[PDB]
Ligand binder design. Structure first.
Ligand SMILES: OC[C@H]1O[C@H](O[C@H]2[C@H](O)[C@@H](O)[C@@H](O)O[C@@H]2CO)[C@H](O)[C@@H](O)[C@@H]1O
Ligand SMILES: N=C(N)c1ccc(CO)cc1
Ligand code: NA
Ligand code: NA
Ligand code: NA
Ligand code: NA
Ligand code: NA
Length: 513
Protein backbone atom coordinates (compact mmCIF):
# COMPACT_ATOMS: atom_id res chain seq x y z
CA UNK A 1 0.00 0.00 0.00
CA UNK A 2 0.91 3.67 -0.48
CA UNK A 3 2.66 5.31 2.48
CA UNK A 4 -0.26 7.79 2.50
CA UNK A 5 -2.99 5.21 3.31
CA UNK A 6 -4.66 4.99 6.73
CA UNK A 7 -4.31 8.64 7.78
CA UNK A 8 -5.35 12.16 6.76
CA UNK A 9 -2.69 14.77 5.94
CA UNK A 10 -3.81 18.37 5.40
CA UNK A 11 -1.83 21.33 4.04
CA UNK A 12 -2.81 24.99 4.59
CA UNK A 13 -0.80 28.23 4.38
CA UNK A 14 1.15 29.37 7.45
CA UNK A 15 -0.71 32.71 7.66
CA UNK A 16 -4.06 30.97 8.21
CA UNK A 17 -5.68 29.16 11.15
CA UNK A 18 -3.82 25.83 11.07
CA UNK A 19 -4.07 25.37 14.86
CA UNK A 20 -7.83 25.94 14.66
CA UNK A 21 -8.00 23.41 11.84
CA UNK A 22 -6.12 20.86 13.97
CA UNK A 23 -8.85 21.24 16.64
CA UNK A 24 -11.37 20.15 14.01
CA UNK A 25 -8.90 17.37 13.17
CA UNK A 26 -8.93 16.20 16.79
CA UNK A 27 -12.73 16.01 16.90
CA UNK A 28 -12.55 13.87 13.75
CA UNK A 29 -9.88 11.65 15.34
CA UNK A 30 -12.05 10.95 18.39
CA UNK A 31 -14.93 9.71 16.22
CA UNK A 32 -12.92 7.82 13.57
CA UNK A 33 -9.78 6.47 15.27
CA UNK A 34 -7.75 7.90 12.38
CA UNK A 35 -4.86 10.35 12.86
CA UNK A 36 -5.21 13.77 11.21
CA UNK A 37 -2.08 15.82 10.56
CA UNK A 38 -2.18 19.50 9.64
CA UNK A 39 0.97 21.00 8.11
CA UNK A 40 1.84 24.46 6.79
CA UNK A 41 4.87 24.10 4.48
CA UNK A 42 6.57 27.17 2.97
CA UNK A 43 5.85 27.85 -0.73
CA UNK A 44 2.79 25.62 -0.37
CA UNK A 45 1.15 26.56 -3.70
CA UNK A 46 4.17 25.28 -5.65
CA UNK A 47 5.12 22.49 -3.25
CA UNK A 48 1.78 20.70 -3.72
CA UNK A 49 2.17 19.92 -7.44
CA UNK A 50 5.81 18.91 -6.79
CA UNK A 51 4.76 16.05 -4.50
CA UNK A 52 1.27 15.32 -5.89
CA UNK A 53 2.80 14.70 -9.32
CA UNK A 54 4.53 11.60 -7.89
CA UNK A 55 1.26 10.40 -6.34
CA UNK A 56 2.33 11.66 -2.91
CA UNK A 57 1.50 14.75 -0.84
CA UNK A 58 -1.41 15.69 1.45
CA UNK A 59 -4.88 14.24 1.04
CA UNK A 60 -6.34 17.74 1.33
CA UNK A 61 -4.85 21.00 0.07
CA UNK A 62 -6.09 24.47 1.02
CA UNK A 63 -5.50 27.50 -1.19
CA UNK A 64 -7.36 30.27 -3.01
CA UNK A 65 -9.37 28.81 -5.91
CA UNK A 66 -7.27 30.46 -8.67
CA UNK A 67 -4.60 27.74 -8.37
CA UNK A 68 -7.09 24.86 -8.42
CA UNK A 69 -7.95 24.93 -12.14
CA UNK A 70 -4.27 24.32 -12.88
CA UNK A 71 -4.09 21.52 -10.28
CA UNK A 72 -7.18 19.85 -11.75
CA UNK A 73 -5.90 20.20 -15.33
CA UNK A 74 -2.64 18.53 -14.26
CA UNK A 75 -4.74 15.61 -12.94
CA UNK A 76 -3.92 16.34 -9.29
CA UNK A 77 -7.43 16.90 -7.92
CA UNK A 78 -10.29 14.45 -7.51
CA UNK A 79 -13.81 15.47 -8.50
CA UNK A 80 -15.82 16.02 -5.31
CA UNK A 81 -19.32 14.59 -4.85
CA UNK A 82 -21.44 16.63 -2.41
CA UNK A 83 -25.17 15.94 -2.76
CA UNK A 84 -27.77 18.65 -3.46
CA UNK A 85 -28.51 19.06 0.28
CA UNK A 86 -24.86 19.79 1.05
CA UNK A 87 -24.50 22.15 -1.91
CA UNK A 88 -27.47 24.15 -0.56
CA UNK A 89 -25.43 25.00 2.55
CA UNK A 90 -22.95 27.15 0.60
CA UNK A 91 -23.50 30.25 -1.57
CA UNK A 92 -23.94 29.30 -5.26
CA UNK A 93 -21.22 31.76 -6.28
CA UNK A 94 -18.63 29.94 -4.14
CA UNK A 95 -19.37 26.67 -5.97
CA UNK A 96 -18.84 28.44 -9.32
CA UNK A 97 -15.33 29.39 -8.20
CA UNK A 98 -14.42 25.70 -7.70
CA UNK A 99 -15.86 24.39 -10.97
CA UNK A 100 -13.46 23.27 -13.69
CA UNK A 101 -14.49 21.80 -17.05
CA UNK A 102 -18.04 21.54 -15.66
CA UNK A 103 -17.00 19.51 -12.59
CA UNK A 104 -16.64 20.51 -8.94
CA UNK A 105 -12.99 20.09 -7.94
CA UNK A 106 -12.86 21.56 -4.40
CA UNK A 107 -14.94 22.59 -1.37
CA UNK A 108 -15.27 26.37 -0.93
CA UNK A 109 -14.34 27.61 2.55
CA UNK A 110 -14.24 31.43 2.61
CA UNK A 111 -14.18 34.58 0.49
CA UNK A 112 -11.01 36.66 0.78
CA UNK A 113 -10.55 40.25 -0.35
CA UNK A 114 -7.89 42.81 0.50
CA UNK A 115 -8.91 45.87 2.50
CA UNK A 116 -7.27 49.06 3.68
CA UNK A 117 -6.19 48.62 7.29
CA UNK A 118 -5.32 51.84 9.12
CA UNK A 119 -4.19 53.02 12.56
CA UNK A 120 -7.04 55.14 13.98
CA UNK A 121 -4.73 56.91 16.44
CA UNK A 122 -2.24 58.04 13.79
CA UNK A 123 -4.91 58.44 11.12
CA UNK A 124 -8.52 58.88 12.39
CA UNK A 125 -9.59 59.79 8.86
CA UNK A 126 -7.96 57.50 6.24
CA UNK A 127 -7.56 58.76 2.65
CA UNK A 128 -10.27 58.19 0.06
CA UNK A 129 -7.74 58.37 -2.77
CA UNK A 130 -4.30 56.95 -3.60
CA UNK A 131 -3.35 60.45 -4.81
CA UNK A 132 -3.32 61.90 -1.28
CA UNK A 133 -0.88 59.34 0.21
CA UNK A 134 2.30 61.18 -0.92
CA UNK A 135 1.30 64.33 1.04
CA UNK A 136 0.16 62.17 3.97
CA UNK A 137 3.50 60.35 4.03
CA UNK A 138 5.66 63.49 4.15
CA UNK A 139 3.59 64.71 7.11
CA UNK A 140 4.06 61.39 8.93
CA UNK A 141 7.77 61.21 8.01
CA UNK A 142 8.20 64.41 10.02
CA UNK A 143 7.12 62.41 13.09
CA UNK A 144 9.24 59.33 12.29
CA UNK A 145 6.29 57.42 10.80
CA UNK A 146 5.24 56.39 7.28
CA UNK A 147 1.83 56.53 5.55
CA UNK A 148 1.62 53.07 3.99
CA UNK A 149 3.46 49.74 3.93
CA UNK A 150 2.43 46.50 2.22
CA UNK A 151 3.99 43.43 0.58
CA UNK A 152 5.62 44.52 -2.69
CA UNK A 153 7.02 41.04 -3.44
CA UNK A 154 3.65 39.41 -4.22
CA UNK A 155 1.57 40.98 -7.04
CA UNK A 156 -1.64 40.07 -5.18
CA UNK A 157 -1.27 43.24 -3.08
CA UNK A 158 -0.53 45.62 -5.97
CA UNK A 159 -3.24 44.22 -8.28
CA UNK A 160 -6.08 46.35 -6.84
CA UNK A 161 -4.18 49.47 -7.95
CA UNK A 162 -3.26 48.03 -11.36
CA UNK A 163 -6.89 47.11 -12.05
CA UNK A 164 -8.37 50.37 -10.69
CA UNK A 165 -8.06 52.41 -13.92
CA UNK A 166 -8.57 49.51 -16.36
CA UNK A 167 -5.91 46.82 -15.87
CA UNK A 168 -7.16 43.23 -16.16
CA UNK A 169 -5.92 39.64 -16.45
CA UNK A 170 -7.89 37.78 -19.14
CA UNK A 171 -10.94 39.09 -20.98
CA UNK A 172 -14.13 37.10 -20.40
CA UNK A 173 -15.87 36.54 -23.76
CA UNK A 174 -18.33 33.91 -25.05
CA UNK A 175 -18.76 32.38 -21.57
CA UNK A 176 -15.00 31.86 -21.11
CA UNK A 177 -11.67 33.59 -20.48
CA UNK A 178 -9.73 34.54 -23.61
CA UNK A 179 -6.04 33.78 -22.93
CA UNK A 180 -5.08 35.81 -26.02
CA UNK A 181 -6.74 38.93 -24.59
CA UNK A 182 -4.52 40.05 -21.71
CA UNK A 183 -4.93 43.50 -20.11
CA UNK A 184 -1.76 43.81 -18.03
CA UNK A 185 -0.24 46.31 -20.48
CA UNK A 186 -3.07 48.75 -21.25
CA UNK A 187 -3.28 52.44 -20.28
CA UNK A 188 -4.99 51.60 -16.97
CA UNK A 189 -2.42 49.02 -15.87
CA UNK A 190 0.46 51.35 -16.81
CA UNK A 191 -1.12 54.23 -14.87
CA UNK A 192 -1.54 52.12 -11.71
CA UNK A 193 2.00 50.71 -11.70
CA UNK A 194 3.49 54.12 -12.58
CA UNK A 195 1.85 55.55 -9.45
CA UNK A 196 3.37 52.72 -7.40
CA UNK A 197 6.83 53.29 -8.93
CA UNK A 198 6.48 57.05 -8.29
CA UNK A 199 5.73 56.36 -4.60
CA UNK A 200 9.01 54.44 -4.44
CA UNK A 201 10.97 57.05 -6.46
CA UNK A 202 9.72 59.75 -4.07
CA UNK A 203 10.72 57.76 -0.94
CA UNK A 204 7.12 57.08 0.14
CA UNK A 205 7.73 53.30 -0.08
CA UNK A 206 10.66 50.84 -0.22
CA UNK A 207 10.78 48.33 -3.12
CA UNK A 208 12.19 45.73 -0.68
CA UNK A 209 9.14 45.79 1.64
CA UNK A 210 7.75 42.26 1.96
CA UNK A 211 4.96 40.64 3.99
CA UNK A 212 7.01 40.29 7.19
CA UNK A 213 8.36 43.86 7.13
CA UNK A 214 4.94 45.37 6.34
CA UNK A 215 3.16 43.44 9.11
CA UNK A 216 5.83 44.27 11.73
CA UNK A 217 5.76 47.99 10.84
CA UNK A 218 1.98 48.27 11.14
CA UNK A 219 1.67 46.12 14.27
CA UNK A 220 4.35 48.25 15.97
CA UNK A 221 2.58 51.51 15.02
CA UNK A 222 5.40 52.68 12.74
CA UNK A 223 3.20 52.99 9.63
CA UNK A 224 -0.32 54.46 9.46
CA UNK A 225 -1.70 52.03 6.87
CA UNK A 226 -1.28 48.57 5.35
CA UNK A 227 -3.07 46.40 2.79
CA UNK A 228 -3.97 42.89 3.90
CA UNK A 229 -6.67 40.25 4.21
CA UNK A 230 -8.82 38.85 7.08
CA UNK A 231 -6.14 36.36 8.20
CA UNK A 232 -3.97 39.26 9.39
CA UNK A 233 -6.50 40.78 11.86
CA UNK A 234 -5.57 38.28 14.59
CA UNK A 235 -1.95 39.46 14.87
CA UNK A 236 -3.17 43.08 14.88
CA UNK A 237 -5.54 42.19 17.77
CA UNK A 238 -2.51 40.98 19.77
CA UNK A 239 -0.50 44.11 18.85
CA UNK A 240 -3.05 46.37 20.62
CA UNK A 241 -3.00 48.79 17.65
CA UNK A 242 -6.31 50.65 17.37
CA UNK A 243 -7.09 49.63 13.79
CA UNK A 244 -9.99 49.96 11.37
CA UNK A 245 -10.73 48.03 8.17
CA UNK A 246 -12.12 50.03 5.24
CA UNK A 247 -12.56 50.45 1.49
CA UNK A 248 -9.31 50.66 -0.48
CA UNK A 249 -8.46 54.13 -1.84
CA UNK A 250 -9.67 55.15 -5.30
CA UNK A 251 -7.23 55.76 -8.17
CA UNK A 252 -8.01 58.40 -10.80
CA UNK A 253 -11.51 58.50 -9.30
CA UNK A 254 -11.95 54.75 -9.82
CA UNK A 255 -12.35 52.26 -6.97
CA UNK A 256 -9.46 49.82 -6.44
CA UNK A 257 -10.35 46.37 -7.77
CA UNK A 258 -8.74 43.56 -5.73
CA UNK A 259 -8.73 40.04 -7.14
CA UNK A 260 -11.17 38.10 -4.97
CA UNK A 261 -10.07 34.67 -3.74
CA UNK A 262 -12.18 31.80 -2.48
CA UNK A 263 -10.13 29.76 -0.01
CA UNK A 264 -10.91 26.18 -1.04
CA UNK A 265 -10.15 22.60 0.03
CA UNK A 266 -9.25 20.12 -2.72
CA UNK A 267 -8.78 16.36 -2.49
CA UNK A 268 -5.58 14.83 -3.89
CA UNK A 269 -6.54 12.69 -6.90
CA UNK A 270 -3.91 10.12 -5.88
CA UNK A 271 -5.13 9.95 -2.26
CA UNK A 272 -6.16 6.50 -0.95
CA UNK A 273 -8.21 8.34 1.69
CA UNK A 274 -10.78 10.15 -0.50
CA UNK A 275 -14.01 9.05 1.22
CA UNK A 276 -12.39 9.81 4.59
CA UNK A 277 -11.46 13.30 3.36
CA UNK A 278 -15.03 13.89 2.09
CA UNK A 279 -16.44 13.01 5.51
CA UNK A 280 -13.94 15.30 7.24
CA UNK A 281 -14.67 18.29 5.00
CA UNK A 282 -18.47 17.89 4.74
CA UNK A 283 -19.35 16.72 8.24
CA UNK A 284 -16.67 18.28 10.45
CA UNK A 285 -15.05 21.33 8.86
CA UNK A 286 -17.96 22.84 6.92
CA UNK A 287 -20.15 23.18 10.02
CA UNK A 288 -20.73 26.17 12.32
CA UNK A 289 -18.53 24.56 14.98
CA UNK A 290 -15.78 23.56 12.53
CA UNK A 291 -15.47 26.95 10.85
CA UNK A 292 -15.69 28.71 14.23
CA UNK A 293 -12.60 26.85 15.45
CA UNK A 294 -10.57 27.87 12.39
CA UNK A 295 -12.00 31.41 12.41
CA UNK A 296 -11.14 32.02 16.09
CA UNK A 297 -7.51 31.18 15.30
CA UNK A 298 -7.18 33.32 12.16
CA UNK A 299 -10.24 35.04 10.60
CA UNK A 300 -11.29 33.24 7.40
CA UNK A 301 -13.11 36.24 5.93
CA UNK A 302 -16.63 35.84 4.57
CA UNK A 303 -17.27 32.10 4.97
CA UNK A 304 -19.01 30.07 2.24
CA UNK A 305 -21.23 28.33 4.79
CA UNK A 306 -24.41 30.43 4.89
CA UNK A 307 -25.42 29.43 8.44
CA UNK A 308 -22.13 30.70 9.89
CA UNK A 309 -21.73 33.75 7.61
CA UNK A 310 -25.05 35.00 9.04
CA UNK A 311 -23.23 35.33 12.37
CA UNK A 312 -20.15 37.03 10.88
CA UNK A 313 -22.03 39.44 8.59
CA UNK A 314 -22.53 41.98 11.43
CA UNK A 315 -18.74 42.42 11.67
CA UNK A 316 -17.78 45.82 10.17
CA UNK A 317 -14.45 44.29 9.09
CA UNK A 318 -16.42 41.65 7.15
CA UNK A 319 -18.66 44.37 5.69
CA UNK A 320 -15.50 46.19 4.55
CA UNK A 321 -14.13 42.92 3.13
CA UNK A 322 -17.28 42.44 1.04
CA UNK A 323 -17.42 46.09 -0.08
CA UNK A 324 -13.92 45.67 -1.50
CA UNK A 325 -14.94 42.28 -2.91
CA UNK A 326 -17.94 43.90 -4.66
CA UNK A 327 -15.63 46.48 -6.26
CA UNK A 328 -13.15 43.78 -7.23
CA UNK A 329 -13.28 40.64 -9.35
CA UNK A 330 -13.28 36.90 -8.55
CA UNK A 331 -10.07 35.46 -10.01
CA UNK A 332 -10.22 33.07 -12.96
CA UNK A 333 -9.14 29.50 -12.14
CA UNK A 334 -7.80 28.65 -15.59
CA UNK A 335 -4.39 26.88 -15.77
CA UNK A 336 -2.84 30.08 -17.22
CA UNK A 337 -3.18 31.79 -13.83
CA UNK A 338 0.21 30.33 -12.87
CA UNK A 339 1.97 32.05 -15.79
CA UNK A 340 -0.11 35.20 -15.23
CA UNK A 341 0.97 35.53 -11.60
CA UNK A 342 4.62 34.86 -12.44
CA UNK A 343 4.48 37.52 -15.17
CA UNK A 344 2.86 40.17 -12.95
CA UNK A 345 5.13 39.39 -9.97
CA UNK A 346 8.19 39.83 -12.20
CA UNK A 347 6.78 43.05 -13.71
CA UNK A 348 5.88 44.64 -10.35
CA UNK A 349 9.20 43.74 -8.71
CA UNK A 350 11.21 44.87 -11.78
CA UNK A 351 9.39 48.21 -12.10
CA UNK A 352 9.81 48.73 -8.34
CA UNK A 353 13.54 47.93 -8.34
CA UNK A 354 14.22 50.00 -11.47
CA UNK A 355 15.34 46.86 -13.31
CA UNK A 356 12.81 47.79 -15.98
CA UNK A 357 10.65 50.83 -16.76
CA UNK A 358 6.90 50.41 -16.27
CA UNK A 359 6.37 50.10 -20.04
CA UNK A 360 9.18 47.52 -20.33
CA UNK A 361 7.92 45.55 -17.33
CA UNK A 362 4.30 45.32 -18.51
CA UNK A 363 5.21 44.68 -22.16
CA UNK A 364 7.10 41.55 -21.04
CA UNK A 365 4.21 40.65 -18.71
CA UNK A 366 1.74 40.78 -21.62
CA UNK A 367 3.99 38.46 -23.66
CA UNK A 368 4.35 35.88 -20.87
CA UNK A 369 0.93 36.04 -19.15
CA UNK A 370 -0.26 32.83 -20.84
CA UNK A 371 3.10 31.42 -21.96
CA UNK A 372 4.26 27.81 -21.63
CA UNK A 373 6.97 27.38 -19.02
CA UNK A 374 9.02 24.83 -17.10
CA UNK A 375 10.85 24.63 -13.80
CA UNK A 376 14.33 23.48 -12.84
CA UNK A 377 14.54 20.22 -10.91
CA UNK A 378 16.70 22.07 -8.37
CA UNK A 379 14.99 24.26 -5.78
CA UNK A 380 16.35 26.88 -3.38
CA UNK A 381 15.23 29.39 -0.76
CA UNK A 382 17.40 32.02 -2.51
CA UNK A 383 16.29 31.92 -6.16
CA UNK A 384 12.96 30.88 -7.71
CA UNK A 385 13.11 27.80 -9.95
CA UNK A 386 10.31 28.93 -12.27
CA UNK A 387 9.09 30.04 -14.69
CA UNK A 388 11.60 28.98 -17.32
CA UNK A 389 10.12 30.31 -20.53
CA UNK A 390 11.18 31.29 -24.03
CA UNK A 391 13.59 34.20 -23.58
CA UNK A 392 14.65 33.18 -20.07
CA UNK A 393 18.37 33.20 -19.34
CA UNK A 394 19.58 29.95 -17.78
CA UNK A 395 22.79 28.32 -16.60
CA UNK A 396 23.23 25.14 -18.63
CA UNK A 397 25.41 22.16 -17.73
CA UNK A 398 26.72 20.58 -20.98
CA UNK A 399 26.81 16.77 -21.07
CA UNK A 400 30.33 16.72 -22.60
CA UNK A 401 31.51 20.33 -22.06
CA UNK A 402 33.78 22.03 -19.50
CA UNK A 403 34.86 19.75 -16.57
CA UNK A 404 35.49 22.01 -13.45
CA UNK A 405 31.81 22.07 -12.34
CA UNK A 406 31.15 24.87 -14.84
CA UNK A 407 27.84 25.98 -16.35
CA UNK A 408 27.24 28.16 -19.45
CA UNK A 409 24.86 31.13 -19.61
CA UNK A 410 22.32 30.25 -22.31
CA UNK A 411 19.01 31.60 -23.64
CA UNK A 412 15.88 29.44 -23.79
CA UNK A 413 14.58 29.21 -27.36
CA UNK A 414 11.90 26.58 -26.79
CA UNK A 415 9.85 24.95 -24.03
CA UNK A 416 8.68 21.47 -25.05
CA UNK A 417 7.37 18.13 -23.71
CA UNK A 418 4.84 19.82 -21.40
CA UNK A 419 7.55 22.11 -19.98
CA UNK A 420 9.83 19.21 -19.05
CA UNK A 421 12.40 19.78 -21.81
CA UNK A 422 14.09 22.84 -23.30
CA UNK A 423 16.06 24.03 -26.30
CA UNK A 424 18.79 26.48 -25.27
CA UNK A 425 21.26 28.50 -27.36
CA UNK A 426 24.93 28.44 -26.30
CA UNK A 427 26.69 31.78 -27.02
CA UNK A 428 30.08 30.08 -26.51
CA UNK A 429 31.64 28.10 -29.39
CA UNK A 430 31.13 24.32 -29.50
CA UNK A 431 33.87 21.69 -29.96
CA UNK A 432 34.09 22.76 -33.64
CA UNK A 433 34.50 26.43 -32.69
CA UNK A 434 30.96 27.34 -33.75
CA UNK A 435 28.94 29.60 -31.43
CA UNK A 436 25.14 29.70 -31.22
CA UNK A 437 24.56 25.94 -31.01
CA UNK A 438 21.10 24.88 -29.83
CA UNK A 439 20.99 22.12 -27.20
CA UNK A 440 18.12 19.98 -25.91
CA UNK A 441 18.08 19.47 -22.13
CA UNK A 442 15.98 18.26 -19.21
CA UNK A 443 14.99 19.90 -15.90
CA UNK A 444 18.17 18.73 -14.13
CA UNK A 445 20.54 20.36 -16.64
CA UNK A 446 19.61 24.00 -16.06
CA UNK A 447 19.16 26.72 -13.45
CA UNK A 448 16.94 29.78 -13.82
CA UNK A 449 18.86 33.06 -13.85
CA UNK A 450 16.60 35.66 -12.16
CA UNK A 451 15.20 38.23 -14.65
CA UNK A 452 15.46 40.91 -11.95
CA UNK A 453 17.44 42.08 -8.93
CA UNK A 454 16.97 39.44 -6.18
CA UNK A 455 16.18 40.86 -2.73
CA UNK A 456 17.38 37.78 -0.82
CA UNK A 457 21.03 37.88 0.28
CA UNK A 458 23.25 34.80 0.58
CA UNK A 459 24.53 34.14 4.13
CA UNK A 460 28.36 34.10 4.34
CA UNK A 461 29.77 30.65 3.58
CA UNK A 462 27.03 29.73 1.07
CA UNK A 463 28.25 27.56 -1.81
CA UNK A 464 27.31 29.17 -5.15
CA UNK A 465 27.73 29.16 -8.94
CA UNK A 466 28.61 32.62 -10.22
CA UNK A 467 29.40 34.11 -13.60
CA UNK A 468 33.00 35.26 -13.76
CA UNK A 469 33.12 38.99 -14.61
CA UNK A 470 33.59 39.63 -18.36
CA UNK A 471 32.56 36.03 -19.19
CA UNK A 472 29.37 34.06 -19.87
CA UNK A 473 30.52 31.10 -17.75
CA UNK A 474 29.54 30.15 -14.18
CA UNK A 475 32.20 28.94 -11.75
CA UNK A 476 31.95 27.40 -8.24
CA UNK A 477 32.51 29.94 -5.42
CA UNK A 478 31.87 30.74 -1.73
CA UNK A 479 29.99 33.79 -0.44
CA UNK A 480 32.23 35.84 1.87
CA UNK A 481 29.84 38.76 2.34
CA UNK A 482 27.32 41.13 0.80
CA UNK A 483 27.85 44.82 0.02
CA UNK A 484 25.25 47.38 1.12
CA UNK A 485 23.87 47.51 -2.43
CA UNK A 486 23.49 43.71 -2.54
CA UNK A 487 26.60 42.91 -4.61
CA UNK A 488 28.11 39.56 -3.62
CA UNK A 489 31.73 39.51 -2.43
CA UNK A 490 32.92 36.11 -3.59
CA UNK A 491 35.91 33.81 -3.43
CA UNK A 492 36.05 31.71 -6.58
CA UNK A 493 37.36 28.28 -5.63
CA UNK A 494 38.80 28.36 -9.20
CA UNK A 495 42.48 29.31 -8.99
CA UNK A 496 45.32 27.26 -7.76
CA UNK A 497 46.95 29.61 -5.09
CA UNK A 498 45.52 32.82 -3.56
CA UNK A 499 42.19 33.68 -1.97
CA UNK A 500 41.21 36.79 -3.96
CA UNK A 501 37.86 38.52 -3.49
CA UNK A 502 35.74 39.05 -6.61
CA UNK A 503 32.57 41.15 -6.61
CA UNK A 504 29.68 39.73 -8.67
CA UNK A 505 26.16 41.09 -9.27
CA UNK A 506 23.66 39.18 -7.08
CA UNK A 507 21.53 38.29 -10.12
CA UNK A 508 24.48 36.31 -11.51
CA UNK A 509 25.17 34.40 -8.30
CA UNK A 510 23.16 31.16 -8.29
CA UNK A 511 22.63 28.64 -5.48
CA UNK A 512 24.74 25.51 -6.01
CA UNK A 513 22.48 22.43 -6.50
O1 LIG B 1 0.62 37.28 -5.29
C1 LIG B 1 0.17 36.31 -6.22
C2 LIG B 1 -0.70 35.27 -5.52
O2 LIG B 1 -1.92 35.87 -5.09
C3 LIG B 1 -2.81 34.99 -4.43
O3 LIG B 1 -2.23 34.48 -3.24
C4 LIG B 1 -2.62 35.09 -2.03
C5 LIG B 1 -3.61 34.19 -1.29
O4 LIG B 1 -4.77 33.98 -2.06
C6 LIG B 1 -3.97 34.83 0.05
O5 LIG B 1 -4.83 33.99 0.78
C7 LIG B 1 -2.70 35.10 0.86
O6 LIG B 1 -2.10 33.87 1.24
O7 LIG B 1 -1.79 35.90 0.11
C8 LIG B 1 -1.40 35.36 -1.15
C9 LIG B 1 -0.44 36.35 -1.82
O8 LIG B 1 0.75 36.42 -1.05
C10 LIG B 1 -3.20 33.83 -5.36
O9 LIG B 1 -4.09 32.97 -4.69
C11 LIG B 1 -1.93 33.09 -5.78
O10 LIG B 1 -2.20 32.02 -6.67
C12 LIG B 1 -0.98 34.08 -6.45
O11 LIG B 1 0.22 33.42 -6.77
N1 LIG C 1 -28.80 31.75 6.83
C1 LIG C 1 -29.64 32.25 5.92
N2 LIG C 1 -30.29 33.40 6.14
C2 LIG C 1 -29.88 31.49 4.64
C3 LIG C 1 -30.54 32.15 3.61
C4 LIG C 1 -30.78 31.50 2.41
C5 LIG C 1 -30.39 30.18 2.24
C6 LIG C 1 -30.68 29.53 0.92
O1 LIG C 1 -32.10 29.44 0.76
C7 LIG C 1 -29.73 29.49 3.28
C8 LIG C 1 -29.47 30.16 4.49
NA1 NA D 1 1.89 33.10 -3.98
NA1 NA E 1 -9.25 42.39 -12.43
NA1 NA F 1 -13.43 59.65 -6.28
NA1 NA G 1 -22.31 11.19 5.67
NA1 NA H 1 31.76 26.18 -3.60
Amino acid sequence: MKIEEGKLVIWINGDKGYNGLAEVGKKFEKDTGIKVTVEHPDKLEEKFPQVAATGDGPDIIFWAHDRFGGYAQSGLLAEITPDKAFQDKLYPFTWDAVRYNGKLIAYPIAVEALSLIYNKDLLPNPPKTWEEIPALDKELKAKGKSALMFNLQEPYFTWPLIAADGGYAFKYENGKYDIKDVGVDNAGAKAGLTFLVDLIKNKHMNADTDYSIAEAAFNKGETAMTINGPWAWSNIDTSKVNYGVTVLPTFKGQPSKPFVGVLSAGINAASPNKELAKEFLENYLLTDEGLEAVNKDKPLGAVALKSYEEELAKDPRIAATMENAQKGEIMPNIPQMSAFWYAVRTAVINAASGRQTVDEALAAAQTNAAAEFGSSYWTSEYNPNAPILVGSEVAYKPRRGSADGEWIQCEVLKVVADGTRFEVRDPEPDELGNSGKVYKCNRKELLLIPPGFPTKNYPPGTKVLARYPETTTFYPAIVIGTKRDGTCRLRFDGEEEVDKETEVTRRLVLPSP
